[PDB]
Amino acid sequence: GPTWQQSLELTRKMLRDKQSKKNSGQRLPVLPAWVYERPALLGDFLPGTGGSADTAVPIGSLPLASQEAAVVEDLLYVLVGVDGRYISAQPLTGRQGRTFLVDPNLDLSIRELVSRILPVAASYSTVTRFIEEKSSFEYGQVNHALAAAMRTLVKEYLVLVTQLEQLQRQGLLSLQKLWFYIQPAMRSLDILASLATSVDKGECIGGATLSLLHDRSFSYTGDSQAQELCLHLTKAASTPYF
């Protein structure tokens, strides 16, 4: 059965063949890549991901502060695309948002807030999967530019994630503050995850992907909380096309 990675590799092959014929024989950007040979190991989420078999302790038996630290670390690993220790990236069939299962051992309020973050973990997992998929030049120019901008925003998000991880490590953070700090950031992450998922599902490329981005930034229009990121991404994506 085809997984989202296998589907994307077959799509890459067919799109290379298509551009080969549509260009009448003109050159195509082709490079050797081992990124697809082990994507789940490079901070992304692929069908086959999980939690951590080497970091697994009873969070309930752990004190509240220890549980919080462990959950923050697992959350931040999910928000960087890799699995957690108590938050496990679940396998995905077809290219969709990467789901993250929370261990049921967490406290009701703790597990509540873990699930609240989990939107961020799924957003980052899907973001890094799209980032490392379009990171290689097989799809269109707009696709590669979008991947570049998306991975830039993911790297800034991960700088923030590591700062928050350290602050939680010293016990200077709460789930409410975690949810509050990156509200525009998480808005942008959700918007860009929706854009990326629409690109992946409809295999948009070229002006198709450009139309996807324009519709993404035009469906809301006016007044902004996280559309700055989407507008910057759309400009960079259309830079080769422009």
Partner: peptide
């Protein structure tokens, strides 16, 4: 509705400030 998004976002802002004021 952009005015609706602005309204809901500002209300969530005040809800968040209330929740951070408590505890």
């Amino acid at each position: 509705g952009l005015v609706f998004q602005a309204f809901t976002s500002g209300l969530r802002r005040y809800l968040q400030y209330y929740r951070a004021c408590v505890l």
